[PDB]
Subunit: 80 residues, 2 copies
């Protein structure tokens, strides 16, 4: 069900260089498709540009691995 | 559906050191669970012991990644 998909999303995101955990993930079904919004932790000393790059890389990785996701927004917050 | 799960099984198996493609995969639902049997290609010059190790590693990798699989047999054949 949903929990299995959420596990996969978290595991996929964590394997992306520069992710320091998944801080938040909201996933919902729109029909058979998942729409999700996520916040990742990142090094506080990364630049804003780097954090944007990490978010883009997470979006690509997660959407590539979990084919039912049809919308994924990823934002970042500083995390030790 | 099934095709999405089969894609995941093949992709997981291919990422295991020493797999030279998935030659065969039969997957079936027993209730909500998947039972599967797979043949991987391996280097003809690997030993029988090494081929057994690769099969064990595929079983572990695939079962670890695809939680609905409750039975997976993996065998090997020589592949160029």
């Amino acid at each position: 069900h949903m929990e299995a998909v959420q596990n996969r999303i978290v595991e996929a995101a964590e394997r992306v260089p520069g992710v320091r955990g998944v801080i938040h993930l909201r996933a919902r079904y729109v029909g058979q498709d998942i729409w999700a919004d996520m916040i990742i932790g990142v090094d506080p000393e990364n630049t804003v540009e780097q954090a944007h790059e990490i978010c883009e890389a997470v979006q690509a990785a997660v959407c590539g691995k979990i084919r039912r996701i049809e919308s994924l927004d990823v934002s970042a917050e500083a995390r030790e």
